[PDB]
Symmetry: D2
């Protein structure tokens, strides 16, 4: 079956006991056991189990894990290491992952090595004898740099590293790292998967039995589990993922065409443009596009004016909503970095990031263009 | 005002916007900001804020924190330390706290020193130059050993330790560690606070501004946050905490009287008995009792028969429900420990643990006694 | 078993499939059937079924029904009649029941006869050949008039009437009409049963198989069903009903003692006072008291001052909350009735109604008395 | 703006107080009032208000109403009449509407006249002096007969009738009766609007201030209101209505092409076929199609075999799910009607009804065709 079908019929989301076509919400903390032997030494919440089954199915994995946030998911995966271990990350990682690793886990002796992974040979140069993990976001934020997933998986296997992909921006609908050799795939399900700005959740999938066993142990020992109500809403939201991503992709193509032609717009960052670095790699490992786009207007006041002029783009920092969202990295996500290092990494003052939602394509193109025309 | 009043009117649990007498459930992930300056670099979920306000109020603290489990709360507090730091714990700690510390955080170089804290001088002997934290459960599980909270707080202040009390078994209704000098108090809110076996949650309260700031940073960086629906149910459940604890206490006194007189029952463990170690300390730091009781029947088959004979005690491993619960530590929580070390620590094969619920006192006394009479 | 036990273990509120100790929330609209014969021509939502089971158990009935409001429950019971049929009600009925009957169902040719049922002979005088139903609130609002339930049941059986009691003010914890011969008992579960001001619901119980069949048909044909989430919260709230009612009753006795002695207070209305009409009847059909009390201060400005002076009584129109509530009938529920008819029925301008909550008894007595002292 | 945009930004679904991008769930029953004058004599639940705002916006009405079921919505609209009043309905009405009217409201003296409304002159012939309402489903179930909405609105205005359209099968996305002169439009929101088989709800919209006032009075007097949790899930589901309906429509066109060409298939009923009665009317009042299709196989055992052979069509009686559904009217919805009257109205034994879901178009076409090929 094709993907839109698998979104509806894959996983276990019905109730075997009653035939209910949606999975019951087990708002409970305790399950009675028939006899005392069954209580050897979290007991699986069936609503959470349902969402773990969905994420394992959509990523062609064997094991799914649901955390109370994407940060809790990343944090759990990093706790697969010990003090003294090294992890390689793509060097434009920022936000939650960066803050967790550099302000929490370095205090536990986990060492972080940042690497431009757009060239996989950089990974090979960075490998030390203490390196245990390779962690890759692709495409990355906010400039959407693309990393060769298959080659990174090969390097990781050859050097004995656990390979991890943050697949939030692509979703399982367009890119399946486990199919390319990666050990663990994870998501901030808060974004496209939930899809409605109303669930904070992280999701992790793997095919490795032993990695899954260690993840289950970490989860049950540190306790960052997703609740049953949020698990329910996550499964619900994932039902329309294909339709939403396809609408978003149609709008993405049209919007990019408009931006590349507009006078007030300079550089445009998105893996669909041929001139974009590793465009061929992206087409080879994905069969669609993210809804995050970055582009340069002339300066900060042009950016702020763009925000104020748009009727349908909403000022906010998240992504993957049904509403289209707009932000200025240099004033929001990266305002802490000093201006010159920002400039030197690409985060010019006129950089704008949009997250395409599911409004009508013509409305989003026309709104953004009338806003740009006011410059 | 007295306590039952404070349970109803303390904290902020109403809606200022509409006048709603219960706190709205903010099933959302994003809040729109009026202008771009407000988005400097989790945004406070108002339902979670409401429950944090309640726990801070009930413990006479200044700051509350809600985690997706009691294990996530403990785990967050332990992440206040770095590799090389030492934490002292009471030596009969087991279950989630023990597993987290000895199987997760020792891998990050956090060293654990177990100490019989029923004698505070043992704490003073155990203090090393690397010791940073003193973590105390009182009363402990399953034998309900009592530790002098005030004296432990004094030792911790004098030696520069963060002092932490796990106050799950007493609840804020009967024992307030922050009032005795402790820095951080925490709870598995899954138990008495929620009170209905339908929420998995952890709660942490403090008066220390700087500790609160570090806890907020850890929370926002590792992401083990409680969801809005569970936050709601937790506040709801806390409304009846006084009535439930008082019923449980009435039944506890009657049940203990029955056990101390029964032929088939040998030792009884509960801090209300005069002969119990540190009974005077407990009366000095608490004004009521936990609903957990342990007692010895003759052997394992007597224990299993007791379980089978009771109409109103349910076999399960948790505690603090509206239902009364029954368990046998040596076959359940402590079955992994070899039999002779069990015996040597008190976990005889005939040890039974009950959690008194809110059924009618006469029914619980009579049911347990008719069961014991079948021995 | 005693009542507090039955509140915890009566009904079916666990999950047979998984052993979950709380009943799952079936947020679903459809159940798959194995083969096409099972789909003969609402399908029972198992969460709603659980709450219907609880209300049937607590009232010693055979059949329970959950509606989206107490008004929907009353409205469904009235639809047991046809145009031309007559129903007798106690004559101080007002609010939702009165509005429904006199502004909706008289338009369908259902005739209403109001009768002072404090004298059951008035019922017998009012019986016509078209009379089909006898509908009784006891105690009534806001003056708490008491009707002899057993005698009314006898009259109804002898004359072929369906007898209905609105048992909201007493709850199943204190008064069981089905045990006294009544055909149908109903509740605004919004009040004491839910108990937390967060569920709008109606509940109906019966032992009559044929009446139950007609109620099920009316329910499935008009569709005023309670949702699964509210059903869940209702069962949850009913768990603590005994503890809450007992606290409320303790405070009720103390508060009445204070009111009967205070200078600024004239008449006091509550069925516990010996001089209250039918006090002996009430003691004979109930084994506790409602938490609604009415009393007279001197005039409207004394009433408003009382409201403003109380720290713990909250101005609102509902009842059965964990918070104590205060209201002035003549300005709120009965402001529409002209002043002289109000006066003539008992609704003097200084009449105050309070609903006792579960705060500390001493706090509620002292707060109300300090407020009264400011007069 | 175009429709997909209006689905996202129309109505009030954000929180003004906090900026939350989704509407808070007000799980509450009571709102505190600042001073006693505000409590003159249901108070608007803001979650329900949000969904009423959405349905009013999507139908270009002024007033929205949410009921606990579509049956409760119909039932409320019918209670706009008195005993002796007559309502005209399209004559193939069945199921909930028919059962409500003929088994409940005729007992209240409301008279029902069934009329083939595919010819509006039949309406004019049926008008009596007691007629007060014209109630039309279009397209109808299960044969999808089409009624001229605009002409029916003209007849109703000219003769002083309240005109009502059941717009469930089309949704507001494709057909807007209020724009064609109709007084009241309603929906079983359980179907396409919620869209996920997890909400039971009815929705009613109007532009008439006085009709809205009477509906509000009926609602508040009979109490069939939608709960806050279901209101929330309904708004959530309506977010993707455009994407879902458009997918369903693409599959509908392809599936019909397959059915019209298949040997084992005889008649096909859907308003998109040119030869279908009133196809021109439907194109004139709607700009898309319903996902319900009916078609004839040869006999009952062919129908049952079709059901068993399909991988992606699920046996169930509802419609508007994300899953495609299959049913046989003569064995399910219409099994009660005697076989010969069934045959005489079109409900042959080989009639199959499908509800197209949002699976991949190719999968649904191919699955249904391979099933038909097994005949
Ligand atoms: C790398 C990264 N992951 C995750 C998040 C937030 O996701 P969640 O809300 O699910 O924790 C952020 C936000 O800044 C982020 O930068
Ligand atoms: C010390 C300790 N804390 C907490 C828990 C479980 O609490 P929660 O379910 O809230 O994580 C356990 C269970 O074994 C435990 O032993
Ligand atoms: C007789 C009666 N029943 C019920 C209610 C309200 O109960 P509910 O909110 O459950 O419909 C009222 C409110 O005025 C009332 O007067
Ligand atoms: C005419 C009609 N309306 C509504 C329904 C069911 O809708 P709901 O579940 O929202 O009451 C049915 C089911 O048979 C029906 O026939
Ligand atoms: Na692999
Ligand atoms: Na202190
Ligand atoms: Na009877
Ligand atoms: Na009009």
């Amino acid at each position: 079956s094709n993907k839109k079908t698998k979104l509806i019929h894959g996983g276990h989301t019905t109730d075997d006991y009653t035939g209910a076509v949606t999975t019951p919400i087990y708002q409970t903390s305790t399950y009675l056991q028939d006899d005392i032997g069954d209580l050897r030494q979290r007991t699986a919440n069936p609503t959470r189990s349902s969402v773990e089954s969905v994420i394992a199915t959509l990523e062609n994995g064997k094991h799914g894990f649901a955390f109370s946030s994407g940060v809790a998911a990343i944090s759990a995966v990093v706790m697969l290491l010990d003090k003294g271990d090294h992890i390689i990350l793509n060097s434009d990682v920022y936000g939650g992952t960066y803050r967790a690793l550099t302000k929490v886990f370095t205090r536990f002796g986990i060492e972080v090595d940042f690497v431009d992974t757009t060239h996989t040979d950089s990974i090979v140069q960075a490998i030390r004898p203490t390196t245990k993990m390779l962690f890759i976001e692709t495409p990355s934020n906010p400039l959407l740099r693309v990393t060769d997933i298959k080659k990174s998986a090969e390097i990781a296997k050859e050097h004995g590293l656990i390979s991890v992909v943050d697949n939030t921006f692509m979703t399982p609908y367009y890119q399946n790292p486990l199919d390319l050799g990666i050990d663990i795939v994870l998501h901030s399900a808060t974004k496209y998967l939930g899809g409605h700005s109303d669930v904070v959740a992280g999701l992790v999938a793997t095919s490795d039995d032993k990695l899954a066993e260690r993840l289950a142990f970490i989860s049950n020992s540190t306790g960052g589990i997703l609740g049953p109500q949020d698990s329910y809403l996550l499964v619900r939201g994932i039902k329309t993922l294909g339709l939403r991503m396809e609408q978003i992709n149609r709008s993405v193509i049209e919007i990019i065409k408009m931006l590349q032609a507009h006078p007030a717009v300079q550089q445009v960052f998105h893996p669909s443009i041929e001139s974009h670095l590793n465009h061929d790699v992206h087409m080879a490992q994905a069969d669609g596009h993210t809804g995050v786009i970055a582009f340069e207007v002339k300066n900060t006041e042009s950016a702020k004016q763009l925000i104020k002029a748009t009727s349908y783009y909403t000022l906010a920092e998240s992504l993957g909503a049904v509403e289209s969202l707009i932000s200025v990295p240099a004033l929001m996500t990266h305002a802490s970095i000093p201006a010159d290092i920002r400039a030197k990494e690409g985060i010019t003052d006129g950089l704008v990031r949009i997250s395409v939602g599911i409004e009508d394509t013509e409305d989003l193109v026309d709104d953004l263009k009338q806003a740009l025309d006011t410059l």
